Amino acid sequence: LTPRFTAEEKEVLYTLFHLHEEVIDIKHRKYSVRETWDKIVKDFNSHPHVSAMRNIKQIQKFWLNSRLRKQYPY
DNA sequence: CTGTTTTCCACTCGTTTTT
DNA sequence: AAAAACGAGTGGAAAACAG
Numbered sequence: 567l568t569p570r571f572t573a574e575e576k577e578v579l580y581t582l583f584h585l586h587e588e589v590i591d592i593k594h595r596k597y598s599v600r601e602t603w604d605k606i607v608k609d610f611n612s613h614p615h616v617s618a619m620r621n622i623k624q625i626q627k628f629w630l631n632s633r634l635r636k637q638y639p640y
Numbered sequence: 641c642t643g644t645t646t647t648c649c650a651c652t653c654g655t656t657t658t659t
Numbered sequence: 660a661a662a663a664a665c666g667a668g669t670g671g672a673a674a675a676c677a678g
Contacts, residue, residue, distance in 0.1 A: 570656085570665065592648070592674085599647085627667065630649070635664080 569618045571628060578613055579628060582606045584640035590629070 571579070588594045589602040600622075607622050632638045 568666075624666085631666075634649075634651095637664095 568624075572615075572617050574615055575610075575613075575617060576632075578610060579606075579625065580632070580639060582609060583629060583638070587640065 583590070586602055586606060589597060589599060603622050603626065607620065607625050610616065610625065611619050
């Protein structure tokens with residue numbers, strides 16, 4: 567039922583991630599995490615060329631997976 | 641320290657895209 | 660037709676927390 571992330575969208579999320587590295591990545595933390603994530607989700611869902619609206623869980627899952635499957639460029 | 645709660649990540653499943 | 664990629668669920672490791 568739910569679509570997939572477009573290329574452009576992936577670039578957007580990657581950009582946001584690279585920006586807020588120091589807050590969401592354990593490897594940089596060593597403030598509100600939830601609010602930072604919410605900020606990212608908001609910025610994404612507000613982005614014009616967005617396919618579908620996502621919740622915080624989906625975004626986080628994309629973060630986790632893109633790291634797992636080693637495609638996170640930053 | 642011990643014991644509880646929260647957050648992160650490897651493994652995997654069912655489907656969909658790509659070779 | 661086979662392999663790779665993708666979204667998603669989960670258990671338990673790792674970490675953060677309370678006493």
